[PDB]
Short mmCIF file of C-alpha atoms and ligand atoms in Angstrom, two decimals:
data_model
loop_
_atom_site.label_atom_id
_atom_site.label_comp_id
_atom_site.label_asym_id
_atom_site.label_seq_id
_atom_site.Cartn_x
_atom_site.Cartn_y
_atom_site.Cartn_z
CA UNK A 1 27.81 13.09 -20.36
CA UNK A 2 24.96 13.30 -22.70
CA UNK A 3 25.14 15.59 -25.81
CA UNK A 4 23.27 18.59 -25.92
CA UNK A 5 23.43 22.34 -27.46
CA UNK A 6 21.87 25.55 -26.77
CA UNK A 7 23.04 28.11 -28.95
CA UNK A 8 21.75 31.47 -29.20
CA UNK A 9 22.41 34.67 -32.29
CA UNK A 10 25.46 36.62 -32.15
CA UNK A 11 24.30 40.12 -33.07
CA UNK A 12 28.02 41.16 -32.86
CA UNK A 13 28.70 39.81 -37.05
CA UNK A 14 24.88 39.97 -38.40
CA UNK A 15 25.38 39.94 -41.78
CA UNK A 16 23.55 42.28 -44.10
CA UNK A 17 21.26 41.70 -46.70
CA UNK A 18 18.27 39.50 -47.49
CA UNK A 19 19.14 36.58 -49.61
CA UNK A 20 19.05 33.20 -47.95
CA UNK A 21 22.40 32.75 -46.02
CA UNK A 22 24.56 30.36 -43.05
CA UNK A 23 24.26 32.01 -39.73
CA UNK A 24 28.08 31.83 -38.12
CA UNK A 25 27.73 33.72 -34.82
CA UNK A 26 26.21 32.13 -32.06
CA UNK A 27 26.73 32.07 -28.41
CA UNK A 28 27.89 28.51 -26.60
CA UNK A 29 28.72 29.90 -22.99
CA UNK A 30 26.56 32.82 -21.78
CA UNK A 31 23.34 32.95 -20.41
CA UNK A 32 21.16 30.00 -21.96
CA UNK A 33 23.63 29.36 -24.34
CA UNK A 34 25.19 26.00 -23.11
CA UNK A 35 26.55 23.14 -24.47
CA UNK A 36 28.32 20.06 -23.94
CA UNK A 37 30.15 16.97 -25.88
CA UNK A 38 29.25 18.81 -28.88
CA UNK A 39 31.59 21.18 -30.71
CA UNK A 40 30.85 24.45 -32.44
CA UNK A 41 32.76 25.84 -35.56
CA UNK A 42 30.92 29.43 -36.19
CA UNK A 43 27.36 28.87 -36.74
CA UNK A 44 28.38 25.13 -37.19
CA UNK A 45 27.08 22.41 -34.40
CA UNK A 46 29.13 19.26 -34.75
CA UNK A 47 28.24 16.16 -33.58
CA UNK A 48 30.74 14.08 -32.03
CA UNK A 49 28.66 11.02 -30.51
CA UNK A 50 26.21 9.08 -32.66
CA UNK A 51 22.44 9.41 -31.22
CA UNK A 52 18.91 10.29 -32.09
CA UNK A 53 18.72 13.99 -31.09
CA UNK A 54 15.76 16.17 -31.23
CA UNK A 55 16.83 19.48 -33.12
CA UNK A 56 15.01 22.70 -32.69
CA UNK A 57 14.90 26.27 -33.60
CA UNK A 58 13.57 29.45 -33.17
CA UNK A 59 14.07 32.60 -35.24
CA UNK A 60 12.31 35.88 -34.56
CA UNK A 61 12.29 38.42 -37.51
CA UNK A 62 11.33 42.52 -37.29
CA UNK A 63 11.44 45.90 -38.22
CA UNK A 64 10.26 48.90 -36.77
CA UNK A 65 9.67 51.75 -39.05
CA UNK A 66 12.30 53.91 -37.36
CA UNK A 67 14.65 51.83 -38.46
CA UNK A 68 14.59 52.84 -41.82
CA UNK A 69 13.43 51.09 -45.10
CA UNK A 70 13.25 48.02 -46.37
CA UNK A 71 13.85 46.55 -50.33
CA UNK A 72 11.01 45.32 -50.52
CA UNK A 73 7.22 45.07 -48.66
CA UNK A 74 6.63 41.39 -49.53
CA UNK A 75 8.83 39.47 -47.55
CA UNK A 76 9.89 35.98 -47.29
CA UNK A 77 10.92 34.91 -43.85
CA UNK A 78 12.14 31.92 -43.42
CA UNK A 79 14.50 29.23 -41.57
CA UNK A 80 16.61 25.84 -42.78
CA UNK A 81 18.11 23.68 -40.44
CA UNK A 82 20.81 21.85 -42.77
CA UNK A 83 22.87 18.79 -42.32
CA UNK A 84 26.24 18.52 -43.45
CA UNK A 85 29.62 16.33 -43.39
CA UNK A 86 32.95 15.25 -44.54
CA UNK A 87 31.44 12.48 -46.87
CA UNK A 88 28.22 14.67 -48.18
CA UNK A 89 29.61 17.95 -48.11
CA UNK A 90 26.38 19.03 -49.91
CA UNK A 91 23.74 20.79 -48.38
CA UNK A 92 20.66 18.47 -47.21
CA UNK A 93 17.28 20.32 -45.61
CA UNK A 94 16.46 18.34 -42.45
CA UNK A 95 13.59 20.50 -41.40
CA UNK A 96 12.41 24.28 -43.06
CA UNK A 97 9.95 26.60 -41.84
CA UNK A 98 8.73 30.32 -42.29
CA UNK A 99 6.73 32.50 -43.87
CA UNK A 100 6.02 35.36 -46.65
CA UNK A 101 5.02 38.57 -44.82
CA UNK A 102 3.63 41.56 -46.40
CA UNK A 103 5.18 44.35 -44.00
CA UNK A 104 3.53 47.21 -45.71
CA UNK A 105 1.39 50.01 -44.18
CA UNK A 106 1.58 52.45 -42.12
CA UNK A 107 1.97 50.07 -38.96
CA UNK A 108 4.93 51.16 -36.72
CA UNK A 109 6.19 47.84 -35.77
CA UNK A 110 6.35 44.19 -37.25
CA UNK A 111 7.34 40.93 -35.90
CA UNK A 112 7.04 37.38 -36.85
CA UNK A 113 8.85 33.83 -35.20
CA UNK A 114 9.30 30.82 -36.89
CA UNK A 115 9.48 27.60 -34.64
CA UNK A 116 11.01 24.02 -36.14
CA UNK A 117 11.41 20.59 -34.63
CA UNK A 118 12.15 17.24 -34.96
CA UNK A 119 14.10 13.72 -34.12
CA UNK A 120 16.63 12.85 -36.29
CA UNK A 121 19.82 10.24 -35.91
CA UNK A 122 23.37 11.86 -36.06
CA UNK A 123 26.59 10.54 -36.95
CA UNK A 124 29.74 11.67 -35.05
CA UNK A 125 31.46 14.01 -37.52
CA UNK A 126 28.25 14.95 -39.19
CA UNK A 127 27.38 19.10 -38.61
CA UNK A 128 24.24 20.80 -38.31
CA UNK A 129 24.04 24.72 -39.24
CA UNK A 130 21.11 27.65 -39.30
CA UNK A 131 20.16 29.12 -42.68
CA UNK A 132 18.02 31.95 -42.58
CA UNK A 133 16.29 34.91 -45.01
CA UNK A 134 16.64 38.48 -44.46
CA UNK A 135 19.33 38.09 -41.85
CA UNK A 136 19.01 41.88 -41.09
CA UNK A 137 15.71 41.39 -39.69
CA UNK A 138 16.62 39.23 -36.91
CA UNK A 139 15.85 39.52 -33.26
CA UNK A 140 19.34 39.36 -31.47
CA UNK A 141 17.72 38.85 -27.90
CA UNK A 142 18.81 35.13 -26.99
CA UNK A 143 15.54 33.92 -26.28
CA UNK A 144 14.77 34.97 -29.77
CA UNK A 145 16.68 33.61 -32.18
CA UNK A 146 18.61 30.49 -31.13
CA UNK A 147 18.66 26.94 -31.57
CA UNK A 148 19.82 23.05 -30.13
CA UNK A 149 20.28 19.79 -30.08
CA UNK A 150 20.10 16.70 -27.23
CA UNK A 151 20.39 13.25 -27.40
CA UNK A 152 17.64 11.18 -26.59
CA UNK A 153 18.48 7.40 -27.01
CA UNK A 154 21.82 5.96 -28.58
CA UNK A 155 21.75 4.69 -32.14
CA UNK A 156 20.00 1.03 -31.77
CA UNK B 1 11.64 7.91 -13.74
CA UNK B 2 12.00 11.53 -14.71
CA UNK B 3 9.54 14.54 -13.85
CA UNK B 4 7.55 16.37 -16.38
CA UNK B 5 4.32 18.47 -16.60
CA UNK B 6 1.82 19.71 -19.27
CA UNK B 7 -0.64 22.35 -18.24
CA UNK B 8 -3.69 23.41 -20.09
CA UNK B 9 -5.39 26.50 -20.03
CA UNK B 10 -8.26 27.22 -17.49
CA UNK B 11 -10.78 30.25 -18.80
CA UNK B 12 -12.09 29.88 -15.09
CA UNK B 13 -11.21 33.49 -14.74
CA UNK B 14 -11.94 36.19 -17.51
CA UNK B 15 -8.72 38.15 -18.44
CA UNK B 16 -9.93 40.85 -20.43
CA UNK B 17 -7.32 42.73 -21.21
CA UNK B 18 -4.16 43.69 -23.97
CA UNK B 19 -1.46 44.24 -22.51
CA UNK B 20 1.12 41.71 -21.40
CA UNK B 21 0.37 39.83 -18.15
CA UNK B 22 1.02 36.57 -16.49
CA UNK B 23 -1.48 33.57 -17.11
CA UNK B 24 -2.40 31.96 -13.42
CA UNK B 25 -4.84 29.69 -14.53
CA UNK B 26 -4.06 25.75 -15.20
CA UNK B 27 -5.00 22.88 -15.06
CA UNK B 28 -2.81 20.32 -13.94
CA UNK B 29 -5.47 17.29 -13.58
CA UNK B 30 -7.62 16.83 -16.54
CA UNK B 31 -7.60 15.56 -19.59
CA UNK B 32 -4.02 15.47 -21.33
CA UNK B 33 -3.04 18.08 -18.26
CA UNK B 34 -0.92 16.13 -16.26
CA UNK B 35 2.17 16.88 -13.87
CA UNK B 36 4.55 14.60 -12.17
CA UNK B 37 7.41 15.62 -9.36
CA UNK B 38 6.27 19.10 -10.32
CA UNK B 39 4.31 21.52 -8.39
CA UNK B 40 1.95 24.51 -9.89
CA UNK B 41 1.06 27.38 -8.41
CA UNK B 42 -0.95 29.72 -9.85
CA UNK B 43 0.75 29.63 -13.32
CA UNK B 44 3.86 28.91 -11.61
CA UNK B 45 5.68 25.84 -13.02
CA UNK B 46 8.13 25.19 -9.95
CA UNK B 47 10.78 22.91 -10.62
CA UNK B 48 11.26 20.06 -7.53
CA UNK B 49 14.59 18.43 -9.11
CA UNK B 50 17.61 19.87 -10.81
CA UNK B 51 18.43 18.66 -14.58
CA UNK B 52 17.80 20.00 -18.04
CA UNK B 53 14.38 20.02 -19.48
CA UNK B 54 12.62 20.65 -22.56
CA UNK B 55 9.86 23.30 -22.31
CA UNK B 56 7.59 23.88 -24.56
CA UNK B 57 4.15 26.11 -24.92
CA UNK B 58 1.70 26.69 -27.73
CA UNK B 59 -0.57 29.07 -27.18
CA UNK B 60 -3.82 29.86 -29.85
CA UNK B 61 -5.36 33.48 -30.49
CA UNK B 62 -8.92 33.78 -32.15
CA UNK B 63 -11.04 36.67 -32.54
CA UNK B 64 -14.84 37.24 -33.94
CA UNK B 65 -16.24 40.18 -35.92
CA UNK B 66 -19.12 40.06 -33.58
CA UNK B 67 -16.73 40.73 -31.03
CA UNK B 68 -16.98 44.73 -32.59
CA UNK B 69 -16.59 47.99 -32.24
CA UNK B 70 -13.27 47.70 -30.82
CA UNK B 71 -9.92 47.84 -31.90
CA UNK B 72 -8.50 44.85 -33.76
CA UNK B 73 -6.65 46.40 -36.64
CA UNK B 74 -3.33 46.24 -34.88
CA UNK B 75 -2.56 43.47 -33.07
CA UNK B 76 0.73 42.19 -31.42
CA UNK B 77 -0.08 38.71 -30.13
CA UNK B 78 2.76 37.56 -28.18
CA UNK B 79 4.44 34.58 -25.80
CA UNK B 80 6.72 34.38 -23.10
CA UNK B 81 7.96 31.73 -21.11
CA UNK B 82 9.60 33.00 -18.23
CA UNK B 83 12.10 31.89 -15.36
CA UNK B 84 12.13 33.45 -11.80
CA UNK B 85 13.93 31.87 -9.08
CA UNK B 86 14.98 32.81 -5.27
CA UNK B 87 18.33 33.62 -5.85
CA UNK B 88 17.96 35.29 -10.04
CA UNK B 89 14.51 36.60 -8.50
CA UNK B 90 14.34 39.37 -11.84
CA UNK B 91 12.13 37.78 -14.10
CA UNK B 92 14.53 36.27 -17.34
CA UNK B 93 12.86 35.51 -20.34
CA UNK B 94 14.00 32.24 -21.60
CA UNK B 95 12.32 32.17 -25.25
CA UNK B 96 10.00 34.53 -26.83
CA UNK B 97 7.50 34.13 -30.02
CA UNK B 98 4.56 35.72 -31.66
CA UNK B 99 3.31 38.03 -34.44
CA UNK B 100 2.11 40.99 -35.63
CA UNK B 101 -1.19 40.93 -37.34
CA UNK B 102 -4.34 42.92 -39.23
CA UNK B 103 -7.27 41.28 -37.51
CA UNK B 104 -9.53 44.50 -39.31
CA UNK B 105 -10.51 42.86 -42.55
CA UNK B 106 -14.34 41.83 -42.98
CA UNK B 107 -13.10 38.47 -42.64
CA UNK B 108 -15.72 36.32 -39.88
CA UNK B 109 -12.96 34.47 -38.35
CA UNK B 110 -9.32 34.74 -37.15
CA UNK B 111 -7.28 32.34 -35.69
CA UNK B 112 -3.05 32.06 -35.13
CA UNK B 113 -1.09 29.90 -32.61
CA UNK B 114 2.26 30.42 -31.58
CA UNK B 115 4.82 27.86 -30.62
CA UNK B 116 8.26 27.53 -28.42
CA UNK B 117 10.64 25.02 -27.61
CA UNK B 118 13.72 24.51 -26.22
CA UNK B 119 16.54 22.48 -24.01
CA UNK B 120 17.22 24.39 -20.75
CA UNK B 121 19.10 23.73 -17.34
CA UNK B 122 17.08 24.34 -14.37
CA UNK B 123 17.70 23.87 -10.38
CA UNK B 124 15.23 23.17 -7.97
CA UNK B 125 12.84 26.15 -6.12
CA UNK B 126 13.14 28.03 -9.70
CA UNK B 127 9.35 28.38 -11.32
CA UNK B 128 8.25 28.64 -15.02
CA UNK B 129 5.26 31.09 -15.96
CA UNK B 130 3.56 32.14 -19.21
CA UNK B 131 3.24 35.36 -20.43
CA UNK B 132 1.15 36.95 -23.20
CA UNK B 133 -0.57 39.56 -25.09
CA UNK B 134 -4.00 40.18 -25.62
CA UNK B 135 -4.94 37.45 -22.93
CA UNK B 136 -9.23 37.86 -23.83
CA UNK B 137 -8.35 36.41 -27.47
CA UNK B 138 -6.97 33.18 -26.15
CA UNK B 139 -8.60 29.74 -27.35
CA UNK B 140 -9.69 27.71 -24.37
CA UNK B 141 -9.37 24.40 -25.59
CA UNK B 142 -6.96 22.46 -24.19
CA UNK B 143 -5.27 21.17 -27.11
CA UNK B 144 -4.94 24.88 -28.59
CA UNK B 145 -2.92 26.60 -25.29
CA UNK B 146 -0.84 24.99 -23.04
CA UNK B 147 2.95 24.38 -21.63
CA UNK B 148 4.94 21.90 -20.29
CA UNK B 149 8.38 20.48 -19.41
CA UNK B 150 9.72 17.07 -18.88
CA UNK B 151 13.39 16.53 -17.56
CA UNK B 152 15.83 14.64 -20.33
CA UNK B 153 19.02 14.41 -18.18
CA UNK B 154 20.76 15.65 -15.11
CA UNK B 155 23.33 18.15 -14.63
CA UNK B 156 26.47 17.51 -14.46
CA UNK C 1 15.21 0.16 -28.06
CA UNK C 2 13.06 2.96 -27.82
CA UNK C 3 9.63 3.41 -29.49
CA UNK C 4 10.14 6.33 -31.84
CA UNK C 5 8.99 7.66 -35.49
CA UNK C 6 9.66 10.48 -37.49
CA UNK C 7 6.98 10.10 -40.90
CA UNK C 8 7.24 12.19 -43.82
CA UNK C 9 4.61 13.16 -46.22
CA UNK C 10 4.13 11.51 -49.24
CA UNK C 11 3.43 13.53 -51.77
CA UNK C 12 1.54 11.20 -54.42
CA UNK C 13 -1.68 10.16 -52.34
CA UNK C 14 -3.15 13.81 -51.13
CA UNK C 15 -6.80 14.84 -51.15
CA UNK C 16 -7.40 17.53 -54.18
CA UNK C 17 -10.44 18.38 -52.67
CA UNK C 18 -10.68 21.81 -50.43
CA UNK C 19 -12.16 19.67 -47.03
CA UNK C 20 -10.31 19.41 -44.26
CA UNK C 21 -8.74 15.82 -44.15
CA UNK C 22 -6.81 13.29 -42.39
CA UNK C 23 -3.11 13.01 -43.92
CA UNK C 24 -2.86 9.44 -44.90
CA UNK C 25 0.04 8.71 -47.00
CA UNK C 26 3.54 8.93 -45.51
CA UNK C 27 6.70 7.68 -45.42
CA UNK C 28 8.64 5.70 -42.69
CA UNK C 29 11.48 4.09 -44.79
CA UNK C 30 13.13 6.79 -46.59
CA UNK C 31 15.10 10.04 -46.66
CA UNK C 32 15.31 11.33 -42.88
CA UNK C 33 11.99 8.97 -42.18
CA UNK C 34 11.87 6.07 -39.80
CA UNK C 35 10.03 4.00 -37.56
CA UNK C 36 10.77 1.91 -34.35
CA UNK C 37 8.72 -0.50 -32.41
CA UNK C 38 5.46 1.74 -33.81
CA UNK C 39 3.30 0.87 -36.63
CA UNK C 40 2.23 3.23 -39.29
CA UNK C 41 -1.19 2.47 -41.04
CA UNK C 42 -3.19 3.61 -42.97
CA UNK C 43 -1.89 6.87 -42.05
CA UNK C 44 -2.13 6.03 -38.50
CA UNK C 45 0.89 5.97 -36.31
CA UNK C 46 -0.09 3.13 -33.42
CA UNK C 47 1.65 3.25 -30.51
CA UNK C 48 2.71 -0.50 -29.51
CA UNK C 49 4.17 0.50 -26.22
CA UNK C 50 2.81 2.06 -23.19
CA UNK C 51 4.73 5.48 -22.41
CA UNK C 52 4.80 9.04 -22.25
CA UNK C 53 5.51 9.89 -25.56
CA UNK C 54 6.76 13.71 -27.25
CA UNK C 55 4.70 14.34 -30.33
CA UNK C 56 5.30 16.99 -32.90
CA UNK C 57 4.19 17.84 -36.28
CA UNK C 58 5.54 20.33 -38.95
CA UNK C 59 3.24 21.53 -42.14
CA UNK C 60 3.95 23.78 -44.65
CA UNK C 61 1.95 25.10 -47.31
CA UNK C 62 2.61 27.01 -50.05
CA UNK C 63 1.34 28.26 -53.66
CA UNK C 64 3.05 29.24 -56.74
CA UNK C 65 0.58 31.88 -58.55
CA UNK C 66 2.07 29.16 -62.04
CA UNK C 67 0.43 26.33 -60.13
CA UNK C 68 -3.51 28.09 -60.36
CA UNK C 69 -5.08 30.24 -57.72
CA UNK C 70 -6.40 29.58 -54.23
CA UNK C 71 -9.57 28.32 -53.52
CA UNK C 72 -10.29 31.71 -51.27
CA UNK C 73 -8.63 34.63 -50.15
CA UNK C 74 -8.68 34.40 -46.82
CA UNK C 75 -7.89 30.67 -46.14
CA UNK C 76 -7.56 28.59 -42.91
CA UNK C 77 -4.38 26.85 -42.60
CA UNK C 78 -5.01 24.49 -39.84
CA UNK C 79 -3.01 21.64 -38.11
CA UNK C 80 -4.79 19.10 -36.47
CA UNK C 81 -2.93 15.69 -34.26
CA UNK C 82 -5.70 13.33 -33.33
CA UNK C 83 -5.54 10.35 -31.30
CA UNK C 84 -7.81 7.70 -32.12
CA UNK C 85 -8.01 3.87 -30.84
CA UNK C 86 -7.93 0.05 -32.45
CA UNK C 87 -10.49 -0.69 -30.22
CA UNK C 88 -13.07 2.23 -29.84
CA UNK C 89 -14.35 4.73 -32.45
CA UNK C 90 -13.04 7.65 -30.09
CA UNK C 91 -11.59 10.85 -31.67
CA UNK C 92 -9.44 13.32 -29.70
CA UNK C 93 -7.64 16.31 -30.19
CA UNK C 94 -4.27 16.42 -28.63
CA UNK C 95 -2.64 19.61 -30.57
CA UNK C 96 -3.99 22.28 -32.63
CA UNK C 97 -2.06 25.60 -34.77
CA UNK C 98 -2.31 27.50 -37.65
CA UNK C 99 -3.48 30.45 -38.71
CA UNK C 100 -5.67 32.59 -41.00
CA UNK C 101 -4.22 33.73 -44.17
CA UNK C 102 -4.57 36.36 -47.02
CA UNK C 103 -2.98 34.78 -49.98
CA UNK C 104 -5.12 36.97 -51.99
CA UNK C 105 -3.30 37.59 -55.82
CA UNK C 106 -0.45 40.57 -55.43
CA UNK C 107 2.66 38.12 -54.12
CA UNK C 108 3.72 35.84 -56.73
CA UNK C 109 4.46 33.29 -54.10
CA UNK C 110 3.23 32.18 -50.89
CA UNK C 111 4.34 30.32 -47.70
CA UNK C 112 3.48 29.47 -44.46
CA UNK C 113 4.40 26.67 -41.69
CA UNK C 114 2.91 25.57 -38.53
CA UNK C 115 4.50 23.55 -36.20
CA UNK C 116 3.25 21.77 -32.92
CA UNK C 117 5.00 19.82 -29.77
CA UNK C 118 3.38 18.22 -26.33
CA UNK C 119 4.05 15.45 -23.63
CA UNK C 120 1.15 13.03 -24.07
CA UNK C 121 0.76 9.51 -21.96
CA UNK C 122 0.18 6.78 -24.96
CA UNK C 123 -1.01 3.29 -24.39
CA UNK C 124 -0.74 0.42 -26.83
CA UNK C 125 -3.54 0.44 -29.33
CA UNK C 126 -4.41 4.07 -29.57
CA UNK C 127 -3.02 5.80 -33.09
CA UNK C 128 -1.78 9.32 -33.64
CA UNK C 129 -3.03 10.85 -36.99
CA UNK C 130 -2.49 14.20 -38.95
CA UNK C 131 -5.60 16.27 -40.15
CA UNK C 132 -5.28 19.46 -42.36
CA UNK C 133 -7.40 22.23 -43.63
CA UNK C 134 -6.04 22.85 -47.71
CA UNK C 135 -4.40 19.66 -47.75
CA UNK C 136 -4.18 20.67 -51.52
CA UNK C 137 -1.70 23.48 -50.39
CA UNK C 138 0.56 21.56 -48.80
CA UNK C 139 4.11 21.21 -49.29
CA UNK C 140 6.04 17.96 -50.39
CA UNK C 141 9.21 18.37 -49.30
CA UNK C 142 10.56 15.65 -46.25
CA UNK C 143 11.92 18.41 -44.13
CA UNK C 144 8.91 20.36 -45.07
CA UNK C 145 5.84 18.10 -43.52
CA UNK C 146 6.19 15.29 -41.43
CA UNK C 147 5.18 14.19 -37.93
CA UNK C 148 6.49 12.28 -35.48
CA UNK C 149 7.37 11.16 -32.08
CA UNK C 150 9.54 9.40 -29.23
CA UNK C 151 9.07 8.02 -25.67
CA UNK C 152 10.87 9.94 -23.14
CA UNK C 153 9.77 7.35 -20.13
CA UNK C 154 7.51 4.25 -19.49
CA UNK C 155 3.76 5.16 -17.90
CA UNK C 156 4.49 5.31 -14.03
CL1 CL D 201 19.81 27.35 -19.57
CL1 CL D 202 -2.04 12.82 -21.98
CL1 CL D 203 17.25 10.93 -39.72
#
């Protein structure tokens, strides 16, 4: 039973705002979403088998004018995946991607993804999260915003 | 042991157009293009053995000044990878990313690729297809736009 | 023991020039960097086993208006993974991204990240290499830039 995650946004708790912050609701059994001898603790992936995985995400960002307004025209979009766990509780970057994004003008509609992977080796216990900018930008579809993990080889 | 499949794109045909439509033209035998246990069919990725695979496309946009008089001030350059089966016929998008961009300015060149991953289970007699935006401004080379898959595991 | 390698950039040795350039200083014992039955030289990643291999790459660059000004306004931030051989001068292009940018004054910060993935079939001897338009731009950070890859399944 390899390990392996597809998670995708929960638009249902989208938190407000634009300051860099943990996404907590995702999806683990509905439509893509899937996952298997992994656990997930709101927004937080745990591993419980040691491995080299391949992590991965995609977050789609944007704002159409009927919407309303936005703080500010020069934006900063972007997307951490973090590691963390019970002996480094800290925060560590594992991969971070994005964009600023001058959404000014008179243009009706803006959009903008941000893609990330990479292979890294996991511990059982250790937990991998999504930290995003300007949260209340996201794209809710699930083949928008989501992101996973699988195991590729076992740890030497 | 496992199937997999990376398609490149094939400019035989000229799609001129903006809207989104569904690219039919790979190659599946040259260079890096390569397919194994998988069958294409006019941009039609079928899958020939259930599991979970990784698919993955990056597809580049360019455009010339020369290339004038026409409208290139708004732009919404845009991917899809799609999934239709016999059974699910509808077509489901499984993963979506692109950009909004000003390619107006007096600028000579403009050039942005787009990029999507991610872990998905499949079952046999489904197919895989690209869709995208402003098809004539696609880059040709086969190392700017393709897709692919390759299985990792099987279900369970 | 499967080939694998995940390389991070190393910040100290990187071209101040404006040419485009080949990446050659990264890391493969450190931080979330490693290496396994591959050989990094000279800022060449050699493949010592035959295989089909996933390759990726992540680049970011960025500028801090306190850190100078750009070399243009509209710059090309390009992402290039080349495959070269030990044996023959040849020079390929397996992956290309990136993107025109205005980073023209206003913003007191800019950012911007390109990321690439693809199935390739490897064989002993050839090398996979980075090459980047602004190298100068680039940013430092381990979960920032980096490239890497990992066999999925032996050639046939
Ligand atoms: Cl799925
Ligand atoms: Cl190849
Ligand atoms: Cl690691």
């Amino acid at each position: 039973a390899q390990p392996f995650a597809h998670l995708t946004i929960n638009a249902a708790s989208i938190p407000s705002g634009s300051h860099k912050v943990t996404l907590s609701s995702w999806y683990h059994d509905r439509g893509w979403a899937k996952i298997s001898n992994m656990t997930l603790s709101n927004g937080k992936l745990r591993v419980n088998q040691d491995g080299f995985y391949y992590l991965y995400a995609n977050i789609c960002f944007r704002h159409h004018e009927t919407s309303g307004s936005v703080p500010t025209d020069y934006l900063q979009l972007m997307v951490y995946v973090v590691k963390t766990s019970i002996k480094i509780p800290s925060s560590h970057n594992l991969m971070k991607g994005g964009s600023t994004k001058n959404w000014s003008g008179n243009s009706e509609f803006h959009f903008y993804s941000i893609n990330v992977g990479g292979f890294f080796k996991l511990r059982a216990g250790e937990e991998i999260s999504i930290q995003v900018s300007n949260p209340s930008l996201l794209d809710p579809d699930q083949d928008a915003t989501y992101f996973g993990a699988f195991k590729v080889q076992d740890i030497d």
